[PDB]
């Protein structure tokens, strides 16, 4: 009484005030009212706790009873926690499109979502079209892209190409997007991005019986197992339609199938903090999966 809070979207900074009784749902609904977003089911709020870990805020719980890092103001990020199976069909509002575009671009540039060079150049090209508008020889003389972060670091290292040569390659594509509007340019970026192997998947350190280190992938379509040094190639898949239950205890996850005449799939995950997030992402991704097939 009263508690200053800052919530940041991808392109805005919001300043609110909360009371000791304010619930996660209340702060969340205020952000949504302020921003005018209706596709609320993809999003959540992130905070840093007193131990330093990034945590998703629980909505049906008081903000002051979640061990948010004590500072003036309290810091929050409004981000997408879930991703649609198809951007074209599910991202209706332009605000939803913009917020997704910006979050995905950031993850591609931070090398969190892998993207090969040619595709990265083409993606940068749409970002340039979205920011700059139509190519214009009079305004966009060589060097105009020098103060833009356009490519993932992974790309800038592997090649012999200079920064300026990369900017020429991106310019060349930008010229070809002539009459493309901002909204369409962001959607074209998203359509290409969503087909990337690492797009929309949450990766977690995992183990089998033998103790072999693997990756677990949680996404819109189901669960996937990856070998430790290849996050691009699913080795085993668990579609949501084939899953009855997911639970964990201490360090063991049990996935029960629909079939009932089929064996349980079990794996091991080290940290409780992480396992809670794994469980929550499964439930959410499973619920949204069903909704799309039962309107």
């Amino acid at each position: 009484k009263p508690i200053n809070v800052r919530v940041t979207t991808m392109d805005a900074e919001l300043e609110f005030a909360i009371q000791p009784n304010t619930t996660g749902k209340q702060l969340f609904d205020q952000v949504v009212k302020t921003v005018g977003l209706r596709e609320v089911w993809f999003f959540g709020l992130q905070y840093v706790d007193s131990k330093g870990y990034s945590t998703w805020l629980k909505l049906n719980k008081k903000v002051t009873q979640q061990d948010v890092k004590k500072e003036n103001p309290l810091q929050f990020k409004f981000r997408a926690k879930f991703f649609p199976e198809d951007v074209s069909e599910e991202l209706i509002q332009e605000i939803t499109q913009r917020l997704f575009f910006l979050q995905v671009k950031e993850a591609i540039l931070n090398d969190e979502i892998y993207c090969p060079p040619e595709t990265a150049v083409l993606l940068a090209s749409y970002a340039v079209q979205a920011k700059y508008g139509d190519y214009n020889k009079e305004i966009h003389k060589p060097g105009y892209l020098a103060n833009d972060r356009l490519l993932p670091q992974r790309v800038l290292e592997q090649h012999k190409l200079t920064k300026e040569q990369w900017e020429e390659r991106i310019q060349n594509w930008h010229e070809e997007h002539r009459g493309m509007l901002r909204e369409d340019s962001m959607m074209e970026y998203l359509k290409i991005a969503q087909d990337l192997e690492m797009y929309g998947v949450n990766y977690f350190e995992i183990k089998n019986k033998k103790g072999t280190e693997l990756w677990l992938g949680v996404d819109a379509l189901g669960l996937n197992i990856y070998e430790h040094d290849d996050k691009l190639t699913p080795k085993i898949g668990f579609p949501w339609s084939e899953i009855r239950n997911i639970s964990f205890n201490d360090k063991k996850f049990v996935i029960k199938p629909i079939d009932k005449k089929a064996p349980d799939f079990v794996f091991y995950a080290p940290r409780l903090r992480i396992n809670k997030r794994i469980l929550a992402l499964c439930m959410g991704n499973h619920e949204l999966y069903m909704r799309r097939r039962k309107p």
């Binding site: 089998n208 197992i225 699913p234 080795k235 085993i236 898949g237 079939d259 089929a262 799939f265």
Partner: peptide, 20 residues
């Protein structure tokens, strides 16, 4: 086809997982 996991039943999933 998109980059999806190879098709198999749950017993085959467990066998493949268990010696990766």
């Amino acid at each position: 086809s998109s980059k999806r996991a190879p098709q198999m039943d749950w017993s085959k999933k467990n066998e493949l997982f268990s010696n990766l």
